Amino acid sequence: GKKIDFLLSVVGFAVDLANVWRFPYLCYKNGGGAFLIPYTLFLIIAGMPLFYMELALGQYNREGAATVWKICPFFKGVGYAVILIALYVGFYYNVIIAWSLYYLFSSFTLNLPWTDCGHTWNSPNCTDPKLLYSKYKFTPAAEFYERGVLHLHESSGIHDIGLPQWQLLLCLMVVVIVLYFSLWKGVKTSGKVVWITATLPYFVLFVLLVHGVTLPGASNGINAYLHIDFYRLKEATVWIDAATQIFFSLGAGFGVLIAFASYNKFDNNCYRDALLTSSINCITSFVSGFAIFSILGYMAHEHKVNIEDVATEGAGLVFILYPEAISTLSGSTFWAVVFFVMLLALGLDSSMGGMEAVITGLADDFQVLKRHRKLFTFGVTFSTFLLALFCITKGGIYVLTLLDTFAAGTSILFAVLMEAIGVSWFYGVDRFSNDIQQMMGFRPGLYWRLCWKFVSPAFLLFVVVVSIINFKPLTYDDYIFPPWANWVGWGIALSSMVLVPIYVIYKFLSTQGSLWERLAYGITPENEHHLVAQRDIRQFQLQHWLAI
Ligand SMILES: Clc1ccc(-c2csc3[n+]2CCS3)cc1
Ligand SMILES: [Cl-]
């Protein structure tokens, strides 16, 4: 049972709302298969080594994202930045779960609300195929999503977001209460019911794939998915999106992997865990893309439009597509209930760890918080609830789009780049390899050390620079955000990016001694500070810097 349970956790430690909700519209918005080449390249080169590095760091040092930097005191700013990014993500990650809960509540009927027009939310322009360069939003499913759930028709833009929708308000309250009561006792919440949260997503995906392959237009969708537009690979939008999606689906750069690995056994095999998680993530993402593109190829045929204009390119793509596919199944109410229960379970389980990252990271830094986990959990959860109330307004989709663009973009790329630079160069890739050997019994291969020191940092720096210099003003379908929205988004990104230099400055100023003494204290592990008075600093020799 040692292996079956590990595989179940191991397969579970691989499917989340990233693959099921975000990857579909990033693949659609970016062509089907031209998005997969950069995705796989980044996966290998940067994602797998960084996942391995974070797991090893957490396992060896037994600390969270903030306090793990006792080895290199100058990067506690990086730790704080990743904690802040994790805090930002929840604000809308928990609005997506609220959407799922609302859809589940709406699915308890013999006539699904998204099957045809004729409802109070339907507009005169609603067009039903059965009863008779834009996106088509005049379909029953699009009309339902945008008017009976979002009520987006009551907001003219991000300047007129309006008041929170009360139904989504109740759903968000329920989600927040469930999160709090699942996090208020401690980190130990696995191995009890996660079994059904690990197999249900794959059963749902398999049934969706099998049924959608045999649909009238699925062939065209599959052909578009397997076609590669090579001109799209010369624009850097696909590359930036692929890098950000890789780091958001694997979970690196948020302080979650380090926090959870801090509770591992000192001899746990992090290499095997990283390999299996990455492989399962890639396969699941590919299958999700296949199913999604089959569904929208079917829709292109049914609605008599081009496949590029069938659906939205935003965060509601799955909430349009999956209901459309469900409506084609036999006994569609049962399948809708099953699918939205699966979405609820996936989202709640993932958000649990997402918030645990922040809680553990800040409790390791302050013991007062560690002594009062209930109050601290309540505070974190309540703050998330309010800043998510900001995202369930009539124009809450605009705020959600801005957040999904800026909270973890260049910010997360920069944070992961700083993490890799810190470890590999300042702490020492040789020291890191020695720690991994002391833990798991073997030294990492040359490929892993090369990726940690040279390859991953180079690609991360390139992608950060390209994302900064090739920045497209924010949009949502046919809506163009005002420039101040772009300024606000870049400010949100900087709020996390800037913690690193600020903490470097603060650590330098708060230390006592001469300039060289301050540097030695700042780049020396906290448990070897007695060697600084001995003028024996490894980093002050070329051997440390040329070591691989
Ligand atoms: Cl508030 C929050 C929600 C989700 C994440 C997240 C992004 S990838 C993964 N997670 C979590 C577990 S794996 C982080 C913070
Ligand atoms: Cl993904």
Swiss-Prot record:
UniProt-reported outcome of changing residue 76 to A: Decreased homodimerization and norepinephrine transport
GO molecular function, one term: actin binding
Annotated positions binding (R)-noradrenaline 1: 16, 86, 90, 248
Name of this protein: Sodium-dependent noradrenaline transporter
UniProt keyword RNA-binding, yes or no: no
Sites carrying sugar chains: 125
Outcome reported for the amino acid change (mutating residue 163 to A): Decreased homodimerization and norepinephrine transport
